[PDB]
């Protein structure tokens, strides 16, 4: 890992979170969760992100997100 490698991961992470958030605002719960799942997948320790998402999403939506990992 150089700076390019981490930078591409940070950028993907940020794009997916943004898409996740927009799609959910539009009520496409399924695709929004897919995007959030991609952002979670690239974090070695997603606990804090998950706690923030639990505070931000409706419970059944957060639930769903947990089943996908």
């Amino acid at each position: 890992s150089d700076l390019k490698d981490a930078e591409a991961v940070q950028k993907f992470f940020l794009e997916e979170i943004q898409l996740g958030e927009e799609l959910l605002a539009q009520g496409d719960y399924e695709k929004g969760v897919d995007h959030l799942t991609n952002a979670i997948a690239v974090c070695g320790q997603p606990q804090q992100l998950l706690q923030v998402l639990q505070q931000t999403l409706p419970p059944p939506v957060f639930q769903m997100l947990l089943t996908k990992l």
């Binding site: 979170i17 898409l19 958030e21 804090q48």
Partner: peptide, 11 residues
């Protein structure tokens, strides 16, 4: 979209 990213940085 973006408020979620902002919220995540804050720490």
């Amino acid at each position: 979209g973006x408020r979620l990213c902002r919220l995540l940085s804050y720490a």
